[PDB]
Amino acid sequence: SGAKFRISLGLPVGAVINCADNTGAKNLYIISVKGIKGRLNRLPAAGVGDMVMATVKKGKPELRKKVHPAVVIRQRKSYRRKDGVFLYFEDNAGVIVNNKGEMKGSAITGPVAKECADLWPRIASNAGSIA
Amino acid sequence: MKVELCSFSGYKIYPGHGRRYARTDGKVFQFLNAKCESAFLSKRNPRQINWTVLYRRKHKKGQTRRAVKFQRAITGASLADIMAKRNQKPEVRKAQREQAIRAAKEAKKAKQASKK
Amino acid sequence: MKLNISFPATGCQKLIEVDDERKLRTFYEKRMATEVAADALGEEWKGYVVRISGGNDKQG
RNA sequence: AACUGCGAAUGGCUCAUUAAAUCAGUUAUGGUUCCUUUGGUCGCUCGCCACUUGGAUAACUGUGGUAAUUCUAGA
RNA sequence: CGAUCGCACGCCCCCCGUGGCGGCGACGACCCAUUCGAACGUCUGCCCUAUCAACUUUCGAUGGUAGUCGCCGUGCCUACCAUGGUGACCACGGGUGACGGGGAAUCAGGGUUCGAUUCCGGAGAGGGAGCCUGAGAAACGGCUACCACAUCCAAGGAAGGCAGCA
RNA sequence: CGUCGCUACUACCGAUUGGAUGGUUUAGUGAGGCCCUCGGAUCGGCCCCGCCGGGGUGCCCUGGCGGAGCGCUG
RNA sequence: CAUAGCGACGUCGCUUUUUGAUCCUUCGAUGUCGGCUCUUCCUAUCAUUGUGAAGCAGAAUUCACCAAGCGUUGGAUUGUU
RNA sequence: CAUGGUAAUCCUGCUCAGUACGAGAGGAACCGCAGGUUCAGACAUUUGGUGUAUGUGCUUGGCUGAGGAGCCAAUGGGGCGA
RNA sequence: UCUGGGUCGGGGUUUCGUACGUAGCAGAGCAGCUCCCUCGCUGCGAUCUAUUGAAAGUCAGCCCUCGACACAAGGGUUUGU
Ligand SMILES: [Mg+2]
Ligand SMILES: [Mg+2]
Ligand SMILES: [Mg+2]
Ligand SMILES: [Mg+2]
Ligand SMILES: [Mg+2]
Ligand SMILES: [Mg+2]
Ligand SMILES: [Mg+2]
Ligand SMILES: [Mg+2]
Ligand SMILES: [Mg+2]
Ligand SMILES: [Mg+2]
Ligand SMILES: [Mg+2]
Ligand SMILES: [Mg+2]
Ligand SMILES: [Mg+2]
Ligand SMILES: [Mg+2]
Ligand SMILES: [Mg+2]
Ligand SMILES: [Mg+2]
Ligand SMILES: [Mg+2]
Ligand SMILES: [Mg+2]
């Protein structure tokens, strides 16, 4: 099996990230992170491989005024990968999925973090490359 | 003892050092420190920075004939056979060229006589 | 790692499987068409210098 | 079987684009190119292999890599 | 300014006797002409729209000079100059449920509609763009890159183009 | 004949700095191909000329390993 | 099927996180709402530990006991509680 | 060591197991494994932050006749930085 | 003490990025000098190249010196079962 190790989160609630699928959504506005118990005044933050609730701000009007489950695939904050490498990406990105984990879209633009790849096998198959 | 990486500067990166960059187009770079990384991020050419490996090789800082022929036996003739054929130099080949001349001439003359 | 050792003056190439990285680090970080003395393979390969001519990746 | 030469720029399909554009008739290229066919021309030149020169590569023998492809490497 | 490949096979012999000579081809060629063409030009000709009247001219718009480039002639492009060029005889702009023509339907005459469709010309190969080879391609049952769809994978990669016949 | 009341249908205006799809473009970034100036990982020729060598007679015709000329070049 | 879970007509209490009632202290003045910050305490326990009951088959839930060790969040609107 | 303080917390995934239970739909648990949340105590090997080492380049205006070397602008500004 | 700890110097490490000067038939060019030369030479000129991964800093809370220099058995105040 193997569970995900802790990584630097970097993406709190209120962050707007790119939408890397082809659903017609251009960005995702993160409103919460799944599995976050929280603390007083602490913003729920998400890293790569984290499932979030997000609303698209620009894109198809049929997706706009709704809440979508999403999974972060790229992040601009450097995170240590248990073997020294501090990887970070050119931009924050995520894709729209459902609660089961199936991706609403059918393709992913750009790389996908290895943490997100082996946590969501549905996302990894659609991924063009893994970084 | 892991993979050994090379930077924007071309220096050797040991495990547990530097950072790794993954662009959106799918290319992955690795840097030794923030000096080499920030030079890369400012679209700066490594061939114009005097401490970079790429510069030193461009400006050349600090920086025969072999031929062997062998004889192999081929399918049908051993090396001993081909040695004997090529070692018929002392008038053995001369005997072959003169016996060819007289035999071909006597066959040519007899062929003219065969017709009438 | 497998090695495709071939003798030009006699033919008779053969494939040898090895797993000791100490014997292959004398080959590591070497370009093609370079000759490295392959005396690090056991005891029978003494007096031999061998030239790297090619190879394949993990994916072929 | 492979190297070489030739074809694969024709045919077939469709009508999206395109309103002096395409296209039709007319005229020009004395402002250009043209495989192939066809017919000319190929002793018009004063200049130690020529009774025939050099090296490599296919196919083939053999050792393979990859999960994979009409992928290919080394000898 | 032939180091190429077949077919029958022969003549001269004095210098002799081992050479020189020979026909039918095929292939090959720099150039010329022809043929198939191709490419760009000349004149006349196109549907609706003014709830499109002034457009073009920075970044070429019109012309001149000198070039660059192309297979060639030309603002095709560059530099230096001149301020030109088109329009109520409808420019320019917009639409088209517009590929053009030979043609089709109706039929006194004149006309009114239809021509995606087997012949000719053009264009296009999911949308753009850029090239290799070749005489001829900006080729797509060739390649390269991006975009969009989509394929197999051991997730390290690899492979796409039915507006061809089904 | 018109107002008002009921029922259908059709358009109009209308906050929403509304929405969507084409087309032509300024500016910024910019893959890739082509050209040019370099570059030179490699593969070769000549100068071999450390040697055994030699023939018209050390004055080499050279029959090969190998040194490598550490150069002139494709 | 009164009492797994509820509890009508009635009736007995507890609490001082409501609001009243009163005016004992303070009028030579005890700075008067909320929020933020921070500590501690209570239990009448939402969750977690150990349990009992069901109209508890499993899952989920409901009732009750020991129990306050630990936790009880991020936001739109509103000065707000 | 008298005495005082005192501290750890909860969740998820794999397996158990599509198992027990159930007509079916559905659907656990104990042991074990891998990890997280909140909290606590540290720490600087690495990544990041700072940076007046006023360390070293770049640069504006002015000033020392010019070069060199520097300085002034309340840290002149900016890059990298032990 | 079989010395000591300092101060300089050196080495290492590291930071930045290739110093001044000289040289060049490098350099957009421009201004002068032609019995001259047969294509030449004299200045100004940012920048480039070689010298030169050079120059500069580096414990003050970096590491190792055993190179040089001087200094270190000195001072004061108290303390008794
Ligand atoms: Mg708050
Ligand atoms: Mg149309
Ligand atoms: Mg037609
Ligand atoms: Mg046609
Ligand atoms: Mg075409
Ligand atoms: Mg051809
Ligand atoms: Mg094409
Ligand atoms: Mg009173
Ligand atoms: Mg009273
Ligand atoms: Mg007071
Ligand atoms: Mg008070
Ligand atoms: Mg209680
Ligand atoms: Mg105690
Ligand atoms: Mg200044
Ligand atoms: Mg100065
Ligand atoms: Mg002053
Ligand atoms: Mg900084
Ligand atoms: Mg020192």
Curated annotation (Swiss-Prot), chain A:
GO terms for cellular component: cytoplasm; cytosol; cytosolic large ribosomal subunit; cytosolic ribosome; extracellular exosome; focal adhesion; membrane; nucleolus. The modification Phosphoserine is found at residue 8. Pfam families: Ribosomal_L14. It is found in: Cytoplasm. GO terms for molecular function: large ribosomal subunit rRNA binding; RNA binding; structural constituent of ribosome; transcription coactivator binding; ubiquitin ligase inhibitor activity; ubiquitin protein ligase binding. Keywords: Cytoplasm, Phosphoprotein, Ribonucleoprotein, Ribosomal protein. One of its GO terms (biological process) is negative regulation of ubiquitin-dependent protein catabolic process. Its main location: cytoplasm. The modification Phosphotyrosine is found at residue 29. Component of the large ribosomal subunit. HAMAP family: Ribosomal_uL14 (MF_01367). Component of the large ribosomal subunit. The ribosome is a large ribonucleoprotein complex responsible for the synthesis of proteins in the cell. Belongs to the universal ribosomal protein uL14 family. This is Large ribosomal subunit protein uL14. It comes from Homo sapiens (Human). The lineage of its organism: Eukaryota, Metazoa, Chordata, Craniata, Vertebrata.
Curated annotation (Swiss-Prot), chain C:
There is a cross-link at residue 14 (Glycyl lysine isopeptide (Lys-Gly) (interchain with G-Cter in SUMO2)). Ribosomal protein S6 is the major substrate of protein kinases in eukaryote ribosomes. The phosphorylation is stimulated by growth factors, tumor promoting agents, and mitogens. It is dephosphorylated at growth arrest. The modification ADP-ribosyl glutamic acid is found at residue 35. It is found in: Cytoplasm; Nucleus, Nucleolus. It comes from the Eukaryota. Component of the small ribosomal subunit. Part of the small subunit (SSU) processome, composed of more than 70 proteins and the RNA chaperone small nucleolar RNA (snoRNA) U3. Belongs to the eukaryotic ribosomal protein eS6 family. Component of the 40S small ribosomal subunit. Plays an important role in controlling cell growth and proliferation through the selective translation of particular classes of mRNA. Part of the small subunit (SSU) processome, first precursor of the small eukaryotic ribosomal subunit. This is Small ribosomal subunit protein eS6. The gene is RPS6.
